[PDB]
């Protein structure tokens, strides 16, 4: 029994109850199914589990962190609803997305509703004005990270802004700034908010934040590796320079090899043979191994921050699962 299965057994029912409770406030009966849909499609709930484990580590209690746990999971799902609209995603967690089942525009009315459910949860935390400010900052970080990820694409969008503001160059630093915002900030928030729910120790809150950030970066990097070396080459087909292996490669490839890889990424339809050729360019500079070493760097940073947090056994198990440690080292 993994730490996730165990924490789902301990915290799960209460997490699901809290999500429904905040979303249900003021919710019209004939809109209920549409609004509850995104939280009824499953998910690992890793973020709220992290929130509750962090609270429990520092204080021995997890229940006072339930409102914070619902905030972080509701923000996750709010971002997913709009992500599916923007990317026109049809499937998630093996089921139709909100935009697919209900329509793009119905999905927007749902997303708008989620942000106010998040606000109800904020008002239900131990420190409402502090949570309110951190929620605004984290949502803006996610929005900015998403903006950057799209502008780091090499092709494939029909929004004049995404086309015209597309960045000319994407460095490894750029890539790290982007994933810290898009993926890291909300995982940093999950940990930090668990601590804030049960403790006024600022040092512990800051350690939990730094721990979640680093873990989220390590996770995204690994995810990016899978999304290249497996459906082989999914991020190449999708024109992404905001991919760790690609960004690593672009930093090492010679001028002609560099120009070629960008040419492939910018192809309106990327063929199988384009993928293979792109992967060969990546391998020609050992980009995959370098990406995985970068993931190790952040995983080790997460561990140093985590060492500052008391009673951290369960959080250490979650970290290993989150950064898919066992798997990554096997690769």
Q: Which of 43, 64, 126, 128 binds ligand DMA (CB under 6 A)?
A: 43
Please check if 300 is assigned to a binding site.
Answer: no
Q: Which of 7, 34, 46, 142 binds ligand DMA (CB under 6 A)?
A: 46
Q: Name the one range near Cl ion by CB under 5 A: 6-14, 34-42, 63-71, 323-331.
A: 63-71
Q: Which lies closer to Cl ion via its Cβ, residue 8 or residue 63?
A: 63
Please check if 83 is assigned to a binding site.
Answer: yes
The option from ligand DMA, a copy of itself, Cl ion, none interacting with 273 (CB < 5 to 8 A, set by class) reads none
Q: Are 311 and 57 in contact (CB under 8 A)?
A: yes
Q: Which of 8, 10, 63, 308 binds Cl ion (CB under 5 A)?
A: 63
Rounded to a whole number of angstroms, the minimum distance from the CB of residue 56 to Cl ion is 7
Rounded to a whole number of angstroms, the minimum distance from the CB of residue 112 to a copy of itself is 5
Show contacts with ligand DMA in window 203-222 (CB under 6 A).
219
Show contacts with ligand DMA in window 294-323 (CB under 6 A).
322
Show contacts with a copy of itself in window 149-178 (CB under 8 A).
150-151, 157-162, 165
Calculated CA dihedral for residues 228, 187, 322, 143, nearest 10 degrees: -20
Alpha-carbon distance of 219 to 235, in angstroms, equals 16
Give the footprint of ligand DMA on this chain (CB under 6 A).
43-44, 46-47, 76, 93, 187, 219, 322
């Amino acid at each position: 029994m993994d730490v996730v299965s165990r924490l789902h057994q301990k915290y799960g029912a209460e997490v699901e109850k809290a999500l429904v409770r905040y979303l249900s406030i003021g919710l019209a009966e004939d809109f209920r199914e549409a609004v509850l849909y995104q939280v009824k499609t499953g998910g690992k709930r890793l973020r709220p589990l992290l929130t509750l484990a962090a609270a429990e580590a520092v204080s021995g209690q997890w229940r006072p962190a339930l409102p914070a746990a619902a905030i972080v999971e509701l923000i996750h799902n709010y971002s997913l609803i709009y992500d599916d609209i923007i990317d026109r995603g049809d499937v998630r967690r093996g089921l139709p997305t909100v935009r697919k089942a209900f329509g793009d525009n119905a999905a927007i009315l749902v997303g708008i509703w989620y942000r106010e459910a998040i606000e109800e949860a904020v008002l239900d935390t131990p420190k409402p004005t502090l949570f309110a400010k951190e929620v605004a900052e984290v949502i803006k970080a996610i929005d900015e990270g998403e903006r950057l990820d799209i502008l780091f694409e090499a092709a494939g969008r029909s929004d004049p802004y995404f086309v015209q503001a597309r960045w000319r160059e994407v460095t490894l630093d750029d890539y790290i700034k982007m994933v810290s915002l898009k993926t890291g900030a909300l995982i940093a928030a999950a940990a930090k908010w668990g601590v804030l729910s049960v403790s006024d120790d600022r040092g512990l809150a800051e350690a939990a934040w730094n721990f979640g950030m680093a873990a989220g970066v390590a996770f995204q990097i690994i995810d990016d590796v899978l999304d290249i070396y497996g459906e082989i080459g999914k991020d190449i087909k999708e024109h992404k320079r905001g991919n760790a292996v690609v960004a690593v490669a672009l930093s090492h490839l010679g001028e002609g090899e560099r120009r070629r890889l960008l040419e492939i990424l910018a192809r309106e339809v990327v063929e199988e043979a384009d993928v293979r050729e792109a992967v060969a360019l990546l391998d020609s500079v050992g980009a995959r191994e370098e990406a995985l070493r970068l993931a190790a760097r952040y995983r080790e940073e997460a561990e140093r921050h985590l060492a500052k947090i008391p009673n951290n056994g369960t959080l250490k198990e979650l970290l290993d699962f989150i950064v898919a440690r066992e798997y990554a080292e096997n690769l």
